[PDB]
Amino acid sequence: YLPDGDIDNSIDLSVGSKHFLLGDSVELSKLDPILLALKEIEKESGAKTKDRIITWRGIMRKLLTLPYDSEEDFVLDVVSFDGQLFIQFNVPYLKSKDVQKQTEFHKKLQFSGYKFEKMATLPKPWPECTRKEIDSRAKSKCNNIEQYGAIVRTGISRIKILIGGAVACTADYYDENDPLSRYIELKTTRTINQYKDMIAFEKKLFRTWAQCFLLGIPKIIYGFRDDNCILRTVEEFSTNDIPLMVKNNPLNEQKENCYMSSINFYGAVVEWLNESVKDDQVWKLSYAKRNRQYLVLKEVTDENEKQQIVDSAIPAWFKEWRSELRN
Amino acid sequence: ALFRWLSRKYPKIISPVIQDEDVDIDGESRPTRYEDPNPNGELDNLYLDMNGIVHPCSHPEHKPVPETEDEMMLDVFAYTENVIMMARPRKVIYIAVDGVAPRAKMNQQRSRRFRSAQDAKDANETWDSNAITPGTPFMHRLADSLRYWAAYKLTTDPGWSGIEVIISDASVPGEGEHKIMSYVRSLRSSPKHDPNTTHCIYGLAAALIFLGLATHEPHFKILREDVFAQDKDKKTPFLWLHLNILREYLQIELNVPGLSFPFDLEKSIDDWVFICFFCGNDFLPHLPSLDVRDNSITTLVTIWKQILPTMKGYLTTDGYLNLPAVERLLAELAKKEDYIFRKRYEDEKRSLENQKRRKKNEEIRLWEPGYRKRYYETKFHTKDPQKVKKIARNMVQKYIEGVSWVLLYYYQGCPSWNWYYPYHYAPFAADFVNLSELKIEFVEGTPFRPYEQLMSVLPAASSHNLPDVFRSLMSDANSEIIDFYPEEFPLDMNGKKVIWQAIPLLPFIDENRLLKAVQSKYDQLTEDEKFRNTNRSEILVLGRSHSHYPTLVKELYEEGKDSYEFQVDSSGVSGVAIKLQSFDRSGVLRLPVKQLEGYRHYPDISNRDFLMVEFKQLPKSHAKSMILSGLIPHLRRLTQEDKDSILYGGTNFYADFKQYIGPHGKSQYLPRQGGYKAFIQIHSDEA
């Protein structure tokens, strides 16, 4: 919910920065929510799903962006318990990311994004949402813990993939038939003022389109914060329209459409993943920013790192759950 | 009245209706099919006001002379067909007829009804125009007559396939344009509502302009006649009243700079609407220092503009007042009271000098000092200051109730069907002090029966309309309520110009005495009158070829369902649908008009194609007031000329553009600053 008057009122996105708490990625980037979801899926279904790849949207968007946005370094667990590749971040690497996480400008940017998200949403549908909680959005905290998400059974080649996704907010309500169409993703960046600004804008839209298109989210409401953390203008996008806008830009008309190449590369990556590991074989998928030529798919050994990674990624709750499933 | 002020101050609002018929499409001037594109701009909904048509007395300049009911029914049907043809709705038809009025209203037309009886007696030394009222046998014949017309139009015109007609006859409790307001608010509380659902209303009262702003639907307008050259066989020209353009005006005016709180135009309009309800309305007498003819609306706006920077907020919010906020406005106005009294007195004396060049006892002398004391004992006939001080303070308390009761009545429905202002006069702005200490409350109550209103609204000269049993308690001197029925009443002239605008002082009807006598006469009433003496719920009529026609039959005729929460649909109607009694869609709906072949033929139709279902609104909710989500604004009409000529014009009283009507474009927001698209909109075409 955001009328034009609110963005005409020059809302500040920096108020209450000190209140911005945030959780840690180590226990956040865990398959446990998806693991529970699949737990009930096989609880009432009674048979294991044909889905093979299970992960979070972050890994997928990173590897889609790789052919042209390759400025990323990561390590990916490739555990293959029960013939279902549970790709997720390497848990020791998560602890190292805390040091790699390190400043103040970046944290201010994340706070600006979350404040913009909180300002342009509503905890309840507009009719039943009383006026007091309409005019209380700016006086609340910015909790980076509680989120709403859903699991999507997308498909590439001949493999079914389950992807979780932190849904920002639905458009006007929750459609019980096709919930994906009603979903919206909220993002904000610095306002455009010159050609370099719109080039960085185009790259940001490339990665955002990759994200949404993997989740199949049509709408994009995209904020434009100014230098001093204040929203100035907002505008919307459609997922399918992004490539056409990018490759038909009258300003700076000048290669080819990276979307098809990224999709084909991601399909090749999926084929590589489903052809490389046979069963119950833990690996470590990684990429160095200096590589720029190849993907590092190494397998871990010594029966200690493998076991600790299996225990960390998959709690015994899921492991014991499959026991009766085979029964 | 104030319509002239709206026309003068806001010129671009009015626009003539393009009444084009027999369009020469492809070289043939064939009659315009209902499915043809509208040159007035496309429309979604159409809320009629049958009380805007059914008044033979409202147009006495010509000689219509409706003598037989069949003639007037045929004329009404033809006029409704004409207005719908020139409007061309596409989703919903709402038909509103005045029902049982709230307790605070019939007193205002008791003066009007008694005046119609008073001057009639003096005129003794023509159809019964007082028969248009709930509970009469005429409305019962009118209610069923239009239901045939609704069934006829759906099953004959191919263009009426998707239309849904909603009927709210006079049996439905509530006032006419109050029904329209409540209906839109129910569609407002549905989360699946479409924010771009253009509406429009046919109406005559000037309150419809303010109510159109109250609903806060930008894509809105009003259908109105010429009322310019109609004073003087040929079609009467009509005028559109584009409230969407008017929203552009008030946005510019009500944008006062330098506020400690953020500007909110839609919140300002609520204050602006509230401003126009001291200057004039039909529930409370106007303040003695206020006159719309004296452009008092511009006055209150000015004091409103100066006061806001000091204030921390708005006078009202979602129809609820801020007593400290209004107190400052009223107190500030009290200073101007002395000046205008003398100014009004001097100008009329100056005016009287111009004709001199060409050619209860009043005596208050408002232009002379000390009038405040002299005003009260003159009216209430008591010289004791203690009596005056007690009456003056108490009478202010009731006045604040009304301006609070009326605001809810236009925003949250009727808050009370028992309150009524117990005085014939308004207090000065000076007396509006210590308001915050006062307390306000209401009780919803129950509506009066249609017969109960008749004895509370008919005079002694119209005993025929009311059932003949009640004539004993109405006209005979032995009646215990005969004191409520005087042949002559003291018309307090109040120093006006002509007697017709005086105040018909009448005793206020006691509630207990009014109804207790009626309960002794309910037993001997006829069943036909008894059925006519019961309020019901409105009616929805649905065509066969409509998209949701099978769905209702599937549940209300096959599954034996009782209540089906219909929610939104193709036509946009929402609520609960129930089936009429044991009614079957197998009989024939006869035509009760007994057509005389004077106007068309009107063939009769069985009950096979169409289907009617008992309708009901969505559950009542505390309706807020702000623009919706995803709403697309229309094209801007004002281009920097009337923007300036109204900011600094001060006093400016010296081809339709349908392209500006309806939503324009698809973006929810306007491209400004850095927005890529805005950058492309300016930089890309620059180089």
Added chain:
Amino acid sequence: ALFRWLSRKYPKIISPVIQDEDVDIDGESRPTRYEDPNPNGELDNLYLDMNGIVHPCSHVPETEDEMMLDVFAYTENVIMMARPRKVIYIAVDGVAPRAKMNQQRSRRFRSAQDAKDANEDSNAITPGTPFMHRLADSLRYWAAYKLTTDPGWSGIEVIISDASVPGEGEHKIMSYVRSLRSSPKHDPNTTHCIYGLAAALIFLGLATHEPHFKILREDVFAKTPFLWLHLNILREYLQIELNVPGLSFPFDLEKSIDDWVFICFFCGNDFLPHLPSLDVRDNSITTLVTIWKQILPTMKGYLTTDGYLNLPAVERLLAELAKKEDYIFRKRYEDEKRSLENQKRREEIRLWEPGYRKRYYETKFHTKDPQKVKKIARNMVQKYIEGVSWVLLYYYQGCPSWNWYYPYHYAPFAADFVNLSELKIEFVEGTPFRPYEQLMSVLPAASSHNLPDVFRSLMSDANSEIIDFYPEEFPLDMNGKKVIWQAIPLLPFIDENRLLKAVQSKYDQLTEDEKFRNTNRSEILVLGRSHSHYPTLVKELYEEGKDSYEFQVDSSGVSGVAIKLQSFDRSGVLRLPVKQLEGYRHYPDISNRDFLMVEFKQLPKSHAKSMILSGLIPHLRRLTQEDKDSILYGGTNFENADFKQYIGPHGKSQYLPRQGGYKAFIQIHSDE
């Protein structure tokens, strides 16, 4: 012009003068005696602006001696009409500042053109002509005669400031009143009165912030009748009109008046051309004050303080004016066209059309380079703001620069005044020009007879080094109502450095009599024989041989420094220089035993603060509720009264009876 608007908007500040008749007291038919009570009201000081008498128009005497007696007869009438009791100040124009030189060249050059087409002295009034010298000594004789031959003039000083004194006419009066306020002993209830014709006097009366003030002038729309102009009445209007609510700082009518008279100097003055969107007859003063009060609550302070600008405040003021001229230009063109067919029914710029800013600067400067326009249009703002600062100082702190001038013929639009705070303002006082330098810099080619014969070569010769400064014909830029009613005489501005070199080459060739007229001097002062200070000054300046004696607030109220006059002889006799003519009262010679002529000088200058004094007693209030309600809420609207009292400081209490004061409690409870 302005006076009509003041009359219609403010009706009670104007009143007729009760001249009574020749026999003021009836019964005994006593003729007018000076000691008799004044029906107009008692007055303490009186200032005369000699311009209104020396140039009374009425287009008639032709010779100097014909109207000297007429001037004395007329001046004697106005003095009797008011009857001052303490001081009489006589002001005569001196060498005006350089800013007014350019605005004076166009006045005289136009009259030269008015002479040329007439062919198909009125210019001898300017300082430095021999007519002034005859006039200068004429006043000295009249002052001496009146004091020594009138019993009612026993205790009244007369201060003479002839053309030899540097400074403008009214500027002498303004500086004098400010000097009286720097003396701690000054009486705060010395009612003043100044006689003049210029409309600036109404504003300048409020500059002194002396509530007991008034102005005397004859009825323009009429023995000639005269109109009193009570400034104390006007201050009652202003403190009501300018009292707006919701101020973040406490209300101060003294600063409000300073701001109010400030905005009256954009609409019209005599040093800077008005803004293209501003016209006095178009009620532009109401436009500014309306704008001023709307924006006032937003700021943290007033526009100016003691004549010093607040650039951020003024930058904001005209900002919303820069959003109105588009509507103003449209209204002008529309109404002008509407006026065109009014009598019918019974170009380069096109200001109404948008984008006029480009055409205006391009056409008026004969160039279209955008950089050149940007350079010029930005340089205009810096100069124009300097003048407004210079003028505002000129009315509050004396002349702040004797050589500054506005070097362009047109004013910038309301939009261009942006980035004001970055501008720097600097002034150099310098020295005013000698009277001869002032003459030929303003006298046109048709009035060389006033100029000394030696300098005429540099004026009329074709080989003169400065002949370029003297063109016989000049373009007449219309830019006005119809043809020439406000035509701009485009004249190249005089270069000072070049000019000063040429003129000083002829100083050696002038006579001693003219050299005596080529020097700036100081004003003088006279005293009656029966006056209190007559023994005191003679005891000090003539018995003790004192070089200089300092004054303070005294019986008359004059203050300053007195120095013995070398030319004055105690035993001499003053002889009237004007040859006596029939039909007038012969003026006998009077020995210097009956008066004293002492050189005078004011107190040292100080930074004058603009707030009322202490112990000031206010008069009554004519303003009832109806009087101010018709102004507070009246918006746009279309005589004997009481002057014997309700003029001076009525009452003896500095404060007013209000709230819980003991005396106030007595009166309110006296009735109850």
